[PDB]
DNA sequence: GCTCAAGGTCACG
DNA sequence: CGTGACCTTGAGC
């Protein structure tokens, strides 16, 4: 058996693995634009934010903060790109 | 020679 | 222009 996978960061159903935890597709993507873009974001206020599927609209920074926080490693993008390279770490 | 998940690719709000 | 989500890639079992 496995459970119903959760997106960790926002709270929601997760499609799958991505980036070795349970994430959702949008999460997924930002994860990404952020480290391979080098995006930098700050928080509205003070960085001090939980994040859910509503509040991470509005706060970038702390969205990647929590990514990074659960277990969505940096290093899990591969720089080299290269599809279904799968990256449950170990 | 299938199965799982990196991760493009692009459609919708 | 930022997600939202669905097809393709292509590494492991
Ligand atoms: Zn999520
Ligand atoms: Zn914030």
Redesign the pocket.
Same mark, same amino acid.
């Given at each position: 058996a496995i459970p119903k996978?959760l997106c960790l960061v +926002?709270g929601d159903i997760a *499609?799958?693995?991505?980036?070795?935890?349970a *994430? +959702?597709? #949008? +999460? %997924? #993507?930002?994860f %990404?634009?952020t480290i391979?873009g080098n995006?930098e974001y700050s928080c509205p206020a003070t960085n001090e934010c939980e994040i859910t599927?509503r509040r991470?609209?509005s706060c970038?920074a702390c969205?990647f903060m929590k990514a990074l926080k659960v277990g969505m490693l940096k290093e899990?993008?591969?720089l080299?790109?290269?599809?279904?390279?799968?990256? %449950?770490y170990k």
């Open positions: 996978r +926002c *499609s799958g693995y991505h980036y070795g935890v *994430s +959702c597709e #949008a +999460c %997924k #993507a930002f %990404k634009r391979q995006i599927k991470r609209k970038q969205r899990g993008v591969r080299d790109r290269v599809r279904g390279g799968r990256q %449950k």
